[PDB]
């Protein structure tokens, strides 16, 4: 069981109290990001949950060219700077090109490898070389025993602060399932890397003929309870005050007024299961 | 809908979980009495409602000479002695329509095998026998499609139906449990109790605690479990029962007192 | 060899010209059955394709107890007897309960194990013991290398005349895919049983009409037979079926492809 | 629609199939020339239109320790020698936006890798470079969503897009080919040419492996099925001794079997391209 140091007082580990990697899908404006982060900060401080603010500066992989992509790298890094200065919390964002790794690492405290891109050697190596902890989204196409090779790429250039994020596996066409057995397989084939659960993207599904993802936000509690009960290092979550109006993955986003309600149940379950042993062997 | 199984045993999705626990196949009277005894002691100590499980026949094994159990006549005699001795209700699976009535005289719950869940005459003969029914969800069936089998049971007068998750086909020779399916099963069938068969879900590519925790945390009516004192010689090793069940009860008591977020 | 003889002039084999196991979903009336069988016979004769007429006497797995189930066993065997007498064609039907196997075997030339029921020991043994060739529908949930256990069960009670029928594999919820690599797996792991492709029930898939694409792909692999259901107006049918007027069009493409691949060699790729 | 690739090579779903055939990865000039030479001899003899394929880089090997190929600069020089020596058009894959333009100066078709087909700036870069594009369908993408990749290419002025089947995720560590996908790809994209990558479609793997498995012994089963549907092309990799290939050896056709495979493909293709749809 390895523990990954993110910032003062924030360390992720499979035996430790869970860390919330929480925020929004996509950066739209400064004031909206500050307001939503402000709400996450209030709730996580109230409940004593360690917190890392999440947002994407770009959606580089939208299905349609007409779908919204975000403010982009230059404006996104400025919004993150203001989040950090305003709230004093660390931030997490994803990186889509090798040349983005260094500039992003000047501001972000964790760099994320997107799910479709986790096998791309030069991107992973560039992210790892940037010197921050790395969150690897497990591809929809990848068995949980194969993530070890992604971790070895990071380790090869000297970065041993790697976390592994579950976000669902392809189940026929246009649907995901979460294999709850995958968490242990990920941890035990990688020397105990912290395992995180993206309950938001795991809820994705879609219409065969659709222009954008569908999703299953009404069931977020079902999935979040089940995952946190396994015993894991972190929970990855997106929210929006009105999910029907979100610009990306609205169908899977938690309504922001339900945040305290969800997190109080996560803490209660995490506090309970983190004290329970393995069965006697 | 809560389903009354016997005095002091009612399964329901908002109620404390019921353990449907026992062994894979009936082999002898004395060994069945001994294992059921261990299940009774642990569940009584922990305070978990209990229904004893065993099959009288394995009707779907890979060779005609492979061991099938004591069979119907002998199995029912064993079940009669389990009930008389421990005062416990019992659940067993029915493989042929004509077994329904005889099984129903002794068993308190009749189970529909997963492969057979769509066979009209078997389901109807089971439903008509007048005891609560447990329907194993086929590996091949989506969780919004169980409603038809429940309606078949209702069409011959049986509204005491429970639904059991045992995994979904995931490529060749492998099963995954979609934890989103529990709510689907309950909501599309008017709120039938949902049960999670942790043992047969693990017919897949050590792992039982992880999966049992995950399922119980969703908030469900029951857990379905097989054990053996020495599984080698997917059954739980019998000495781990108390350790497993105390984790199950603590998680279950917690989630059953926390509310739904009605997320729109 | 591992070729299965069904009746005079009709043998199924992975290296032989393909056999059509062709007919209808369910027996509803004598005259409708004779009319459709009549058409299959006329087309298959014209094209020179060996033919076995298919029908179920009961649909045992409909979604309501009040849903129409067909004429039933007694009336069904009566209908098959008149089909055999009128056309001199062998017949295949599926058997759902152990006790049906013997009386069905008096009349039918091939007995079929339903897909959902292929692991049920007493049903399969009763079917195998009745002494006719057996067609095993591969269950949606079963891998192509596991069918061998069903075939062994049949051999353990004296039946070495077993054929294996692809009908799709589970692919997420409410959808089937046909894995074209599984035909060879089925054949090779069972000592060379004839493999058959059920194009009709394989098309119980999503369609966000495609029978031709799929039949061409399957027959091109090089297999023992095609399983097909048809109806004059499928939408007004009782319980996926090909429009009957397209039968000759479909089968002429199937014959031309089959004749071609059956005279080109397997490559031994190490 | 028909996609003109070079003089005497046009791909289309009603046309005689085009072979996009070659090797998995460029290792050296002489081996590339020798293998390309055998493909050119065999296709010319049989009368099959031909585009030579190879990767200059494998940018997505599972292991950091696995072989990647000669790389962009040396790869482009090999391709220039292959073109001058045989007069064959070539196809290669592109992994970063900035590679598209230099690649297009030499390659005659540019390929989008399966895992990267949703990456907007990559697809747009590739499209803008002015050559026909081959899009590998992701293992995670349904056949009716390829239309969105085609629209990205269209949005920047490139309507010469072909769509390549290479299998779909089937549980863990396995692929299946849905033969009903070809039509769905063609009919939702205004009739783009559909290609079938028989080689990568055969991939499977060991859960604890370091590299891909594969099922080359079944390449004929699969290739027959797919060509019989009625498609625009076949995508194929070979090696003289597949066990020693440095990438995807488990799925590679033994090179001495090339003429035998291809003669069957031509026979089935010529037959099916003469047969109509069923009467409505
Ligand atoms: O454009 P659609 O189909 O909604 O796809 C959404 C994705 O871009 C989004 O989930 C993204 O992968 C977050 O990383
Ligand atoms: O490195 P392994 O796991 O063999 O994976 C091989 C892939 O890189 C290869 O298929 C590539 O996608 C195109 O050849």
Coordinates of C-alpha atoms in Angstrom, one line a residue, chain A residues 60-66 69 97 116-117 119-122 125 141-146 149 153 156 169-170 173-174 179 206-211, chain D residues 59-65 68 96 115-116 118-121 124 140 142-145 147-148 152 155 168-169 172-173 178 205-210:
Chain A
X60 CA -10.0 17.5 -26.7
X61 CA -12.1 14.4 -27.4
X62 CA -15.7 15.6 -27.9
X63 CA -17.6 13.3 -30.3
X64 CA -18.8 16.3 -32.3
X65 CA -16.7 19.2 -33.6
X66 CA -19.7 21.4 -32.8
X69 CA -14.5 22.5 -25.6
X97 CA -0.4 16.8 -25.6
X116 CA -8.4 7.1 -24.5
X117 CA -4.8 8.2 -24.3
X119 CA -1.4 3.9 -23.9
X120 CA 0.3 6.8 -25.7
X121 CA 4.0 6.4 -24.6
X122 CA 5.2 10.0 -25.4
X125 CA 6.3 10.0 -20.3
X141 CA -10.7 -0.9 -23.4
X142 CA -8.2 -1.9 -20.8
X143 CA -8.2 -4.8 -18.3
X144 CA -7.4 -3.8 -14.7
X145 CA -4.3 -6.0 -14.7
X146 CA -2.7 -4.0 -17.6
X149 CA 2.5 -1.0 -17.9
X153 CA 6.3 4.1 -18.1
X156 CA 11.0 4.6 -16.1
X169 CA -15.4 -0.7 -18.9
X170 CA -17.1 -1.1 -22.3
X173 CA -22.1 -0.9 -27.6
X174 CA -22.7 2.5 -26.0
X179 CA -16.3 -4.2 -12.3
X206 CA -25.4 6.7 -25.0
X207 CA -27.9 6.7 -27.9
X208 CA -26.4 4.9 -31.0
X209 CA -27.3 7.9 -33.1
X210 CA -26.6 10.7 -30.6
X211 CA -24.3 13.7 -30.8
Chain D
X59 CA 3.4 5.1 -30.3
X60 CA 1.2 3.0 -28.1
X61 CA 3.1 -0.2 -27.2
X62 CA 1.8 -1.5 -23.8
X63 CA 5.4 -1.8 -22.5
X64 CA 8.1 0.9 -22.5
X65 CA 10.5 -2.0 -23.3
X68 CA 8.8 1.1 -31.6
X96 CA 0.7 13.8 -33.4
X115 CA -7.3 4.8 -29.7
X116 CA -7.0 8.4 -31.1
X118 CA -11.9 10.9 -31.0
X119 CA -9.0 13.4 -30.7
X120 CA -10.3 16.5 -32.5
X121 CA -7.0 18.4 -33.2
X124 CA -8.4 17.9 -38.0
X140 CA -14.7 1.3 -27.8
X142 CA -20.1 1.8 -32.0
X143 CA -20.3 1.7 -35.8
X144 CA -23.1 4.4 -36.0
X145 CA -20.8 7.0 -34.3
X147 CA -20.2 9.7 -38.7
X148 CA -18.8 12.3 -36.2
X152 CA -14.6 16.5 -38.4
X155 CA -15.5 20.5 -41.5
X168 CA -14.8 -4.4 -30.8
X169 CA -14.0 -4.9 -27.1
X172 CA -11.6 -8.2 -21.1
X173 CA -8.6 -8.8 -23.3
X178 CA -19.6 -7.5 -35.6
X205 CA -4.4 -11.1 -24.8
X206 CA -3.2 -12.7 -21.6
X207 CA -4.4 -10.6 -18.6
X208 CA -0.8 -10.5 -17.3
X209 CA 1.0 -10.3 -20.6
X210 CA 3.5 -7.6 -21.6

